Ligand binder design. Structure first.
Ligand SMILES: *[C@@H]1O[C@H](CO)[C@@H](O[C@@H]2O[C@H](CO)[C@@H](O[C@@H]3O[C@H](CO)[C@@H](O)[C@H](O)[C@@H]3O)[C@H](O)[C@H]2NC(C)=O)[C@H](O)[C@H]1NC(C)=O
Ligand SMILES: *[C@@H]1O[C@H](CO)[C@@H](O[C@@H]2O[C@H](CO)[C@@H](O)[C@H](O)[C@H]2NC(C)=O)[C@H](O)[C@H]1NC(C)=O
Ligand SMILES: *[C@@H]1O[C@H](CO)[C@@H](O[C@@H]2O[C@H](CO)[C@@H](O)[C@H](O)[C@H]2NC(C)=O)[C@H](O)[C@H]1NC(C)=O
Ligand SMILES: *[C@@H]1O[C@H](CO)[C@@H](O[C@@H]2O[C@H](CO)[C@@H](O)[C@H](O)[C@H]2NC(C)=O)[C@H](O)[C@H]1NC(C)=O
Ligand SMILES: *[C@@H]1O[C@H](CO)[C@@H](O)[C@H](O)[C@H]1NC(C)=O
Length: 200
């Protein structure tokens, strides 16, 4: 890979009842180790969360995770997921991982036929990330993998991220930020609200 960085952030949209524990379980990693007791690694990136035990539907939770070079020379991370009753690749992608992965990606990289995924199988779940692009800006080196929703637009994400629309578009060239699907990469802040800069 041409770029590298020590972490990325995943944007997990809340619907149908998701708790912080389930997010931490699904997105467990060395960077956010799930122990059911200490959620500080996640909470540091979400100062807006007043009560970790009662999170608000319709909001997004930012989760830090490692951002590693993958075969095929792109950046991402392999999460692991223990299969539960009635899981399907579609449901795991759209619901359990909140569009941070795709059903096609899951099906390609796991050996279970779509119609036979047994209880307690483990899935390899790929979520992509970015470390930035020096030709766009030297000012950003931490990125949110942000699945687009119908309510998002370039202007709304620019406003909420505090990053200019032109910079956002240059990081995501040719991508319509109002399309309501797929992922865009948005510069993110450290726990104190500063943007970590790009690092070669
Ligand atoms: C994330 O998980 C995936 C799936 O378990 C890992 O995938 C695979 O990685 C290995 C190399 O680490 C690749 O095996 C290699 O295959 C090539 C040719 O196919 C062969 O010449 C090598 O000797 C080696 O056996 C495999 O192709 C690759 N598969 C895919 C789908 O990309 C991946 O490595 C994990 N990422 C990390 C950072 O560990
Ligand atoms: C969360 O993910 C991490 C990273 O994959 C897991 O880390 C392993 O932890 C065991 C026991 O502490 C170590 O022996 C391994 O060396 C770690 N693996 C790696 C690759 O670092 C961790 O166990 C996971 N936690 C849960 C609840 O699944
Ligand atoms: C992941 O994306 C899917 C597809 O856009 C979202 O599910 C759609 O949600 C709308 C309601 O908002 C429904 O009308 C569609 O029928 C759904 N499509 C499918 C295929 O189920 C889903 O909400 C997204 N997940 C998250 C957590 O945001
Ligand atoms: C993560 O990024 C990789 C690399 O761009 C994506 O992999 C490609 O996926 C497309 C569509 O399925 C395939 O046509 C290509 O063969 C893949 N390229 C490589 C190098 O594997 C991948 O789809 C992205 N994953 C997610 C979950 O967004
Ligand atoms: C939420 O539940 C409804 C009703 O079952 C379903 O249509 C929708 O797909 C669910 N959303 C997610 C994220 O799976």
């Amino acid at each position: 890979c041409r770029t590298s960085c020590p972490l990325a952030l995943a944007s997990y949209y809340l619907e149908n009842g998701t708790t912080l524990s389930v997010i931490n379980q699904n997105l467990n990693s060395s960077i956010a180790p799930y122990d059911q007791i200490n959620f500080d690694p996640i909470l540091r990136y979400n100062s807006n969360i007043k009560d970790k035990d009662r999170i608000q539907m319709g909001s997004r939770v930012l989760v830090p995770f490692p951002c590693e070079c993958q075969p095929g020379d792109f950046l991402g991370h392999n999460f692991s997921y223990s299969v539960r009753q009635e899981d399907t690749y579609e449901r795991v992608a759209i619901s359990n991982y909140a569009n941070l992965t795709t059903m096609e990606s899951l099906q390609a990289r796991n050996p279970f036929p779509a119609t036979n995924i047994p209880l307690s199988a483990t899935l390899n779940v790929l979520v992509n990330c970015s470390c930035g692009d020096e030709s766009v800006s030297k000012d950003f080196g931490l990125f949110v993998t942000y699945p687009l929703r119908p309510e998002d637009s370039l202007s709304s994400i620019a406003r909420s991220s505090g990053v200019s629309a032109d910079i956002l578009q240059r990081y995501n060239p040719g991508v319509n930020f109002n399309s309501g699907n797929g992922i865009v990469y948005v510069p993110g802040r450290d726990p104190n609200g500063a943007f970590p800069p790009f690092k070669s």
